[PDB]
């Protein structure tokens with residue numbers, strides 16, 4: 176289930192972070208315009224950039240922290256607020272986050288591992304609602 180998934184993901188955090196972020200950019204290429212440092216670079220090029228490894232690790236680590244603090248896939252309002260107020264998130268809307276979770280859920284279903292993809296879908300939906308309540312457009 177959801178808690179075990181956090182353990183699986185945290186166990187190989189960088190690899191899963193890179194794979195999910197790439198699944199997201201592959202599914203939604205226009206989203207890459209938010210990441211100027213990664214434009215025009217192949218997957219192997221990105222995986223060779225310490226900047227890409229560091230960014231994806233730290234993003235995914237915070238996502239696992241938020242997931243771990245949730246109760247039955249309902250995140251803390253304060254975690255949503257952190258995400259809304261981050262300067263690096265200026266201009267984004269709930270749609271960007273919904274697309275991330277669409278790609279995340281799709282990745283999990285295609286992986287062949289036993290992720291609880293329905294719980295991650297619900298966690299994403301609850302997090303998006305929390306992001307809107309905390310003021311995200």
Ligand code: HEM
Pocket residue numbers: 206209210229230233234235237238258263264267271272275
């Ligand atoms: C649960 C979802 C998310 C979490 C937990 C999260 C967390 C973070 C964290 C911790 C950072 C700082 C990482 C660093 O040091 O570079 C960051 C930066 C950033 N995030 Fe998010 N993020 C999420 C979703 C998104 C989405 C959906 C987008 C846009 C599609 C986005 C766009 C960005 C950008 C543009 C930066 C700055 C990149 C940079 O400075 O190099 N994030 N995010």
Ligand SMILES: Oc1ccc(Br)cc1Br
Pocket residue numbers: 191192193195196199230231232234235275
């Ligand atoms: O910028 C990102 C890095 C890692 C992940 Br997983 C998702 C996003 Br959006």
